[PDB]
């Protein structure tokens, strides 16, 4: 079916080739052994092959191979051709990937905002970008249009932590209060008071948001009710980073300690000791908590045992950014280095340096199976080959990157890159750069 239907219509009859004669199925069981790259070539072979290399189910897999899961359905030329929603979905990715990799930068949608201020946190939840700024506001943008949709005006202190979950923006401010927001109406539906110090960080998980603050206590808030279900007290210093998987609350405070909490019973299940300094970044896959300290190291902990699993050393400075995914850790470090680790093996898979290494501190990083996107004080957002660890190109290169221009944070969707760009000095008007790496399909 579909493949059959194609033959009975295009009529690619008479083919003196091995696979054209093989029963449709077998020809497929054959082409299936080909990597997409090949299939694509095999598809340019002959109408017959093409029609085969187009077996929908054949790509539904090649896609689940590149983690597509969603086949795209484009939307009238001569001799019809039943395209595979998956082959196209796959190509879309290949192309998107390529558009990212060597795809010509289109001149990003500049989102002038937070004039003369720092976008202290960035949230990118499909088409909606939420820039948090120390200008006490947050702005919800359209990664699409690039137009500012709303400006979460409400905080009296600068916003320093933000979380979003479609229409639900949660901002943490120096003003000592989280604020739940309706990204659409931009209205503050809640003002979470309980934090006396600055709400530095906050990790939202479903209907709850654990917030970390300089007050040494994290607070689990019910994004819906606005209540503060719990208050994690056990941190001597300020909590710079927080991770909440809904089960536990991993925290990192300037107290060199990483506290694993069972929010429910406001009990510090674990006190991860190992960082000879302030733990700034945290990552937690529900199994491993990855603490990144100013102590230069990144400790991979076992949330269960609380036992340090790996003391990933290598960075020469403060590991600011840090993204954990599939036990693969990519740490952004002030050392201008980004590192990719196999937190399972503790191996430093890669180090993103090279002639095109970042010049100054790595401020943010995003990464998928293919690339590591790294922003830096050097005003450049670099695209790296996660796998090869090779620098690919600078997605962004603030002409001021060196004269004060900087890229604070970035968020990458599979198709676009949002970058909080700006500077302490008026050399880069604080804005968001929304690079779009989608393809015309």
């Amino acid at each position: 079916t579909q493949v059959k239907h194609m033959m009975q219509v295009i009529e690619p009859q008479f083919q003196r080739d091995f696979i054209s004669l093989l029963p449709k199925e077998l020809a497929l069981y054959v082409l299936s052994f080909l990597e997409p790259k090949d299939l694509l070539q095999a598809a340019q072979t002959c109408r017959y092959w093409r029609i085969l290399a187009e077996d929908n189910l054949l790509w539904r897999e090649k896609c689940k191979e590149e983690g597509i899961d969603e086949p795209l359905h484009i939307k009238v030329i001569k001799p019809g051709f039943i395209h595979s929603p998956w082959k196209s979905a796959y190509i879309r990715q290949h192309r998107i990937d390529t558009n990212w990799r060597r795809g010509e930068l289109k001149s990003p949608k500049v989102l002038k905002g937070h004039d003369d201020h720092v976008i202290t946190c960035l949230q990118f939840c499909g088409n909606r970008i939420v820039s948090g700024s120390d200008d006490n506001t947050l702005k919800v943008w359209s990664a699409v249009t690039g137009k500012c949709l709303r400006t979460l005006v409400g905080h009296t202190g600068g916003v320093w932590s933000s979380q979003m979950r479609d229409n639900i923006i949660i901002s943490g401010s120096t003003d000592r209060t989280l604020k739940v927001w309706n990204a659409e109406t931009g209205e503050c539906i809640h003002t979470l008071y309980g934090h006396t110090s600055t709400v530095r960080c906050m990790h939202l998980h479903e209907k709850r948001v654990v917030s970390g603050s300089r007050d040494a206590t994290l607070r689990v808030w019910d994004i819906e009710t606005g209540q503060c279900l719990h208050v994690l007290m056990g941190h001597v210093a300020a909590v710079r980073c927080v991770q909440y998987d809904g089960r536990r609350v991993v925290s990192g405070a300037y107290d060199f300690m990483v506290k694993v909490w069972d929010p429910e019973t406001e009990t510090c299940l674990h006190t991860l000791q190992g960082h000879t300094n302030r733990v700034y970044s945290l990552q937690f896959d529900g199994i491993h908590v990855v603490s990144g300290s100013l102590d230069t190291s990144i400790r991979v902990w076992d949330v269960e045992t609380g036992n340090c699993i790996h003391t990933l050393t290598g960075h020469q400075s403060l590991t600011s950014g840090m993204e954990l995914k599939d036990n693969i850790l990519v740490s952004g470090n002030a050392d201008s280095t980004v590192k990719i680790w196999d937190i399972k093996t503790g191996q430093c898979l890669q180090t993103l340096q090279g002639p095109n290494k970042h010049q100054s501190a790595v401020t943010c990083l995003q990464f998928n199976k293919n690339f590591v996107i790294t922003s830096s004080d050097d005003g450049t957002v670099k695209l790296w080959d996660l796998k090869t660890g090779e620098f690919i190109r600078n997605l962004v290169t603030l002409e001021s990157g060196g004269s004060g221009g900087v890229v604070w944070r970035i968020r990458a969707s599979n198709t676009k890159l949002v970058c909080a760009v700006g500077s302490r000095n008026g050399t880069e008007e604080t804005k968001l750069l929304v690079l779009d790496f989608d393809v015309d399909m």
Binding site: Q15, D38, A42
Partner: protein, 134 residues
């Protein structure tokens, strides 16, 4: 023990059971339908003799690859022999072997391997190339 199976050619093959039961088809006919001589219409002695050779021998194995060094006719023959005999093993090896013949990019080259006439019109071929760009 051992059982006898008859190729399409009409050639009976005394192939040890189990060794032949690698072909669930043969197996099915031996354990379910119970064929004194397992009639294999789709497989001639030539190829059946080859599948057995492959079976009595049980990523492309460091042997199957040689055993399949044969020409396309045979390969194709085995693809079916395997498919007909339902010998996932042989089938995977052979089919892959073909695939490998394709794994090398370049449509033009892929043809030089399977003959294949480029039956794409002016615009068509272009479109096909544009669609399977890389």
């Amino acid at each position: 023990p051992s059982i006898k199976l008859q190729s399409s050619d009409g050639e009976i093959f005394e192939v040890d059971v189990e060794i032949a039961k690698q072909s669930v088809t043969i197996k099915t006919m031996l354990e379910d339908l119970g064929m004194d001589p397992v009639p294999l219409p789709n497989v001639n002695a030539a190829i059946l003799k080859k599948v057995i050779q492959w079976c009595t021998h049980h990523d492309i194995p460091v042997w199957d690859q040689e055993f399949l060094k044969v020409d396309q006719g045979t390969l194709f023959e085995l693809i079916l022999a395997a498919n007909y005999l339902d010998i996932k093993g042989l089938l995977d090896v052979t089919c892959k072997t073909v695939a490998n013949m394709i794994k090398g990019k370049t449509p033009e080259e892929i043809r030089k391997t399977f003959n294949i006439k480029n039956d794409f019109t002016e615009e068509e071929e272009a479109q096909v190339r544009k669609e399977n760009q890389w």
